[PDB]
């Protein structure tokens, strides 16, 4: 059954500037600027109030009405990213062979590179290149902890996922071999 | 890729001019004679125009080079000509490189170096018409097999009602074009070296 009208709302903070044209959303805040193309979803954007973004769908099915919630969460996470940022803390733990993590910043590409050595004594050097806009540091407050911060939640979480996926134990009992790099905390920078 | 233009040198040797003829001994040897005159008329304006066309329109530049077969012991007097691609640099750099290399001899050691692997491309030894045993390496049929033992016993024993293109058949063996790779250069010896 087709619903005549459906609406969502996104509040916007005072220090955030949001520009939407042809379903291409650009959100700028104190921390920078994020951009995302939402042209794959039919939606009418509007300014229903000062500081409120309205989302509408007309004559839509239940699935079309449901996609507005995903669009709302995506734009809200972009606003949170340019306002407070996103920070994922990872911890690398080992039993016998100490995991050596080296963080460099490539001047040519502008991205960070994480090199992992001595994982369960292996002689290969694992290299993971971060998505742009993601900053990686080795924490000095705690032991064996990486901190990945950024404005794009998808970029920060996918970079943490890449680091988690590259250090995988193969052909061993994982009840016994506990070695790896794991996402230990998720939150905001501010 | 499409050949746009070709520019030649002012002087062409007789051994490379023999490549354009089948009966050079009877010919008036007229090849490139009208082409050599455009180096003289209008101060080579057509030559310069074609060089500029190569500079501004082309992405791949190849020189034309011929062997000096007269320095070989061969009875053949007609030289071999081929296009050799210039790699590296920009297209203008390639054009200046080739134009500077016009009418000049290039030795082997300024293209290849000792301790390098190269590819060798050639046509193989011809053997003529050959049966399946030496052409494909099939098993010989037993002794005194009826109608021949250097054969294949069943060529089409199943459907379709055809001979399949995958079945070993007698025919031409050798004189095939082959490209072989990873051949190490052990020595580039100099011909003027009396102890090479």
């Amino acid at each position: 059954m087709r619903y005549i009208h459906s609406e969502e709302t996104i509040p916007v903070p005072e220090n955030v500037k949001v520009s939407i044209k042809s379903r291409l959303v650009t959100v700028e805040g104190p921390r920078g600027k994020l951009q995302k193309d939402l042209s794959h979803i039919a939606v009418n954007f509007s300014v229903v109030k000062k500081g409120v973004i309205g989302l509408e769908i007309h004559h839509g099915s239940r699935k079309d009405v449901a996609a507005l919630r995903t669009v709302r969460t995506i734009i809200n996470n972009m606003i949170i990213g340019v306002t407070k940022g996103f920070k994922y803390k990872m911890r690398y733990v080992y039993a016998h062979f100490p995991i050596n993590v080296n963080v460099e910043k490539n001047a040519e590409t502008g991205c960070y590179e994480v090199e992992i050595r001595n994982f369960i004594g292996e002689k290969i050097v694992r290299k993971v290149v971060m998505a742009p806009g993601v900053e990686v540091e080795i924490s000095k407050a705690q032991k064996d902890e990486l901190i990945l911060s950024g404005n794009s939640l998808e970029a920060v979480s996918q970079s943490a996922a890449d680091i988690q996926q590259i250090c995988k134990v193969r052909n061993k009992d994982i009840r016994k071999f506990l070695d790896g790099i794991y996402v230990s905390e998720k939150g905001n920078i501010v | 890729l499409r050949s746009l233009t070709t520019v030649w040198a002012e002087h062409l040797s007789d051994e490379v001019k023999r490549r354009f003829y089948k009966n050079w001994y009877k010919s008036k040897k007229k090849a490139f004679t009208k082409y050599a005159k455009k180096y003289a008329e209008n101060n080579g304006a057509s030559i310069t125009r074609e060089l500029e066309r190569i500079k501004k329109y082309c992405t791949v530049v190849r020189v034309l080079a011929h062997t000096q077969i007269r320095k070989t012991p061969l009875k053949q007097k007609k030289a071999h000509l081929m296009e050799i691609q210039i790699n590296g640099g920009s297209v203008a750099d390639k054009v200046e490189f080739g134009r500077s290399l016009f009418e000049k001899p290039v030795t082997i050691d300024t293209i290849f170096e000792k301790d390098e692997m190269i590819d060798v491309i050639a046509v193989t030894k011809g053997h003529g018409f050959v049966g399946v045993t030496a052409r494909w390496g099939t098993k010989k049929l037993p002794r005194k097999t009826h109608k021949g033992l250097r054969k294949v016993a069943c060529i089409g024993a199943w459907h379709p009602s055809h001979v399949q293109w995958t079945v070993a058949r007698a025919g031409q063996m050798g004189y095939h074009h082959r490209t072989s790779v990873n051949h190490k250069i052990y020595r580039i010896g100099k011909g003027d070296d009396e102890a090479n």
């Binding site: 039919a42 079309d64 | 379709p160 055809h162 001979v163 399949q164 293109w165």
Partner: protein, 203 residues
Amino acid sequence: SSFESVVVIDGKGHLLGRLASIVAKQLLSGQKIVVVRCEALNISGEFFRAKLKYHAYLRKMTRYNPTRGGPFHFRAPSRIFYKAVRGMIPHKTARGAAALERLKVFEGVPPPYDKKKKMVVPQALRVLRLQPGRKYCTVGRLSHEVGWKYQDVVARLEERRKAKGAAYYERKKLAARQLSEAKKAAAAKVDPKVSEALAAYGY
């Protein structure tokens, strides 16, 4: 309904089979057709469905000899459109061969078609035919994934053609401005009998 010397159809945004049906009927009627930008033709449905259909096409081949008689798999987008058109034409008759010779298909817009008028066929336009929310793919993408070698070359040539068209459009805007000012300035010096006579007739 209009008889033309040749109709140049911009293939961008057109559904493959519907455009092929319309083009084949025009060819059999006796109209010359040139379809350009066959890489920008659309196929309805998910991309993997089109890829599955092309791989099912690539399965078929004459078993005893693949160099003759077998279905020859043409990977270029123009040739995919040509196969769709040839399926709707009695190509094994002399009339069908004659109708097929009145058609030309290309990737991109090679000259001199870049300076010719390109038309659209609304009965095959994807934005008018497909329901919003359905999936669609691109014939150029399918061609690149099944082995067409000149996607990047056509892209660079099309970017050059669009830059030259941008310069031409700036000149066209300047000409439109000058013609508007010319009509405005000459409107004062045209006889009012002529002016309201043309106004009454509708010009």
